[PDB]
Amino acid sequence: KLSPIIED
Amino acid sequence: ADQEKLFIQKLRQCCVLFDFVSDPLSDLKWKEVKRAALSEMVEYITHNRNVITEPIYPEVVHMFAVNMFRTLPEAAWPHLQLVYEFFLRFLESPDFQPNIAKKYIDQKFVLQLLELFDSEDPRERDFLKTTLHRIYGKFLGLRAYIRKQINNIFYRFIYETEHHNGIAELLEILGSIINGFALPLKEEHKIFLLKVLLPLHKVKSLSVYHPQLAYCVVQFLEKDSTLTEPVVMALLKYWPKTHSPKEVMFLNELEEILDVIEPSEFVKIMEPLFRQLAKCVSSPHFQVAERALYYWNNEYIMSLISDNAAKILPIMFPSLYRN
């Protein structure tokens, strides 16, 4: 599973 | 810097695309030289520290572009796989500086990278998935362009009937993006969910990418649970009116939705949902009924039902209960 990407 | 010079030399050496149609021996020799050159640099960039200097960046990006940004219809996959692995190790390095790399990794690069997602090779799409996921996360100034360009690929396919082989991988990347959304979900993300993600359920080739699509929908609900109603109703709308094995997917997606649904939102749609669920239990297809009956095993769904049995039980068992 791809690691999360925190929105800016 | 001697070793930097050799690194750049080998990178440029991997930009020479050769072919000996009249010399199989020389062709295999050249291929191995290129294979070894890539393997060396893969190992070199992976385990060595402070080797990615500023002049290296344009050489790596160019080497990738020259090799990968090709036309589709591979057989020479062991070469392409090495380029993918190298560029990934490049992006994932602790010494990697996006501020330097942003000059060469731009919109034209990303766009060309996206065009490769239409590849028929699952192995290649997998590398592209990891690559773009990395690029998205590292380059803030590309995230908007990436989102829109993925949006465009999706706005096709559905409507323009422009078939695509990488819908699954793209949705998997999107799932990673959705899970990290800011607290008040931007309207742009809401629009995307309702106008793109949901209509994706009506496409015929849904089976290929349905698990990834379901995850995105579920993740959207774990963020803002107020989006529950238009999702469930749309899912009930896109539900196969013809009894088909395709129903199992919707039942899978629906139970995964119920696992993260809020009670106040459950009430809003429990009646049309279970009206459909009741039809599924009555289905001529055993697979559909078997899948629908498995709902009662879910303890959280039971909690929602038991605290709403006054309206749900008459729907599931009209002969045994009433309003």
Look up residue B245 and give its DSSP letter.
Answer: T
Place of tokens 């057989």: B75
- Angle (CA) B259-B314-B198 rounded to 5° is 40
Concatenated DSSP letters for B274-302? HHHHHHHHT-SSHHHHHHHHGGGG-HHHH
- Angle (CA) B292-B201-B173 rounded to 5° is 105
Count of residues for chain A?
8
| Separation between Cα atoms, residue B88 and residue B92, nearest integer Å | 6
SS3 content of chain B, % helix, strand, coil (to 5): 70, 0, 30
| C-alpha dihedral, B58 to B64 to B67 to B73, nearest 10° | -130
Place of tokens 């749309």: B234
B112 vs A: CB within 8 A: no
Cα–Cα distances in Å, from B202 out to B13, B198, B205, B246? 48, 8, 9, 11
SS3 content of chain A, % helix, strand, coil (to 5): 0, 0, 100
| CATH number attached to the domain at B1-323 | 1.25.10.10
**Three-state DSSP class for residue B252:** helix
Q: How far is B85 from chain A (nearest CA, A)?
A: 16
Residue-range domain boundaries for chain B: 1-323
A-B CB pairs within 8 A amount to 26
Instruction: Name residues whose C-beta falls within 8 Å of residue B144's C-beta, 6 or more positions apart in sequence.
Output: none
Place of tokens 């010494």: B95
The tokens of B270 are what?
A: 């429990």
| Separation between Cα atoms, residue B136 and residue B180, nearest integer Å | 13
Place of tokens 């990418």: B209
Place of tokens 């080797």: B51
| Separation between Cα atoms, residue B252 and residue B210, nearest integer Å | 10
- Neighboring chain B residues of A6 at a CB cutoff of 8 Å: 180
Identify whether the C-beta of residue B110 lies closer than 8 Å to the C-beta of residue B63.
no
